[PDB]
Design a protein around this ligand. Structure first.
Ligand SMILES: CCCCCCCC/C=C\CCCCCCCC(=O)O
Length: 433
């Protein structure tokens, strides 16, 4: 109620559209607009579960106006406020594409309101994991640009200049959506390890000491800035993070040196982000940390050292590594709070080693040749491998397997593969062939 008054009607409604578009990434323009239509109608005539209930209720109605969370129609079976318990899944495959200047201005003069609403909805559903404060700030600035540029002396020049002034906020928002989505999908502890893994893969040359502080720092920034309703801090924190990146890795790797030479902190960050897993020196094998030092609740130095060492020695994608480390380390951890840890470790050790080895072997089998070749060249070697394992396979059957397996590998064998999507795709591929 307090916000509705201080913000007004139209503005409070704008905030809501962005707010609810983030919540229902899969929702349609119509549905989200409809839900917001009545959420305001509520606040207004209540500034009260008389309307709050009418909302949750009219939400289950088969073929309902409102957008639906996965599990809504399910747990609706009725309390009945299970809906608030349901967590929303991010959109990992953004499809937002900015129209041409003409497309923008024609749409804008014809219907200024719906053009801005369609934009706030589509931009927010696509990059809904970026901080609310940032989305609101970018979409308001963007609409202001559209507003002034389409009626300027020369829209073309206006747009060229104004988009340049907005590039920073623009890249910051999509970048923030990407890293915060990964953060929300994994949770703080796994995100931290995930980032430690990726840095290890990008610079196996470095020592644990060069990358750990960085995994720590990015993690601190995300837990602090990924969620803010009015004052964004991603812009305040990320630049100094690139300074740490360069201080520690600028001289440890040629490619990092080049990244660190770019014009802005944003460019340095993006550049390091897109950097793929480099060729690994292939050092000696590393045994699981089956020792009392992993029991330190105060530190994770041991778990971090193992994670780091495993990453710079095992040619496997981070989505795979992060996936198996969690259960593995948790299993080890079960030998901590017992009367005799040594006996527990000596028993669990041989078992975890085989399970890990099996997972790793299968994962490297699923991603074989992807990283070292161009997609096309990958597709070619992949077929040869399949041909050798399936001599009686018709060319059609081989084509289908090549298609399926190359689809999986393009989605889940890259350093920046989608966590949520791959988690389930990996489960399936593991019990394959
Ligand atoms: C989702 C990643 C799974 C990776 C498997 C590596 C081992 C993890 C350790 C313990 C969890 C158990 C899962 C394996 C099934 C066998 C059951 C058993 O532990 O006896």
């Amino acid at each position: 109620c307090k916000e509705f008054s201080h913000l007004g009607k139209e503005d409070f409604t704008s905030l809501s559209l962005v707010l609810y578009s983030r919540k229902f990434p899969s929702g349609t323009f119509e549905q989200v607009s409809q839900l917001v239509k009545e959420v305001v109608s509520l606040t207004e005539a209540c500034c009260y579960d008389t309307r709050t209930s009418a909302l949750s209720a009219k939400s289950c109605e088969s073929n309902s106006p409102f957008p639906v969370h996965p599990g809504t129609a399910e747990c609706c079976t009725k309390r009945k406020l299970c809906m608030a318990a349901l967590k929303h899944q991010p959109q990992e495959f953004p499809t937002y594409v900015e129209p041409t200047n003409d497309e923008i201005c024609e749409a804008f003069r014809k219907d200024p309101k719906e053009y801005a609403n369609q934009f706030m909805w589509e931009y927010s559903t696509n990059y809904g994991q970026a901080p609310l404060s940032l989305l609101v700030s970018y979409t308001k600035s963007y609409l202001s640009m559209v507003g002034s540029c389409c009626t300027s002396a020369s829209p073309t020049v206006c747009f060229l200049k104004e988009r340049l002034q907005l590039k920073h906020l623009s890249l910051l928002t999509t970048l923030s959506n990407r890293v915060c989505s990964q953060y929300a999908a994994y949770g703080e502890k796994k995100s931290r390890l995930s980032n430690l893994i990726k840095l290890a893969q990008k610079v196996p040359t470095a020592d644990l000491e060069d990358v750990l502080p960085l995994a720590e720092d990015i993690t601190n920034i995300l837990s602090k800035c990924c969620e803010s309703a009015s004052e964004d801090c991603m812009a305040k924190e990320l630049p100094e993070h690139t300074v740490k990146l360069c201080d520690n890795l600028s001289t440890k790797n040629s490619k990092f040196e080049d990244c660190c030479q770019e014009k802005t902190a944003m460019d340095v960050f993006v550049c390091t982000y897109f950097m793929p897993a480099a060729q690994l020196p292939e050092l000696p094998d590393v045994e699981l940390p089956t020792n009392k030092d992993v029991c330190d609740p105060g530190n994770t130095k041991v778990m971090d050292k193992y994670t780091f060492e495993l990453s710079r020695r095992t040619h496997l994608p981070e989505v795979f590594l992060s996936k198996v480390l969690e259960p593995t380390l948790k299993s080890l951890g079960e030998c901590c709070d017992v009367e005799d840890s040594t006996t527990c470790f000596n028993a669990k050790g041989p078992l975890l080693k085989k399970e890990l080895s099996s997972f790793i072997d299968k994962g490297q089998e699923l991603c074989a040749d992807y990283s070292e070749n161009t997609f096309t060249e990958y597709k070619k070697k992949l077929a040869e491998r399949l041909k050798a394992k399936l001599p009686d396979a018709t060319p059609t059957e081989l084509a289908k397997l090549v298609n399926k397996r190359s689809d999986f590998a393009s989605n889940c064998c890259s350093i920046n593969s989608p966590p949520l999507y791959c988690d389930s795709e990996i489960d399936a591929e593991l019990k394959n062939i």
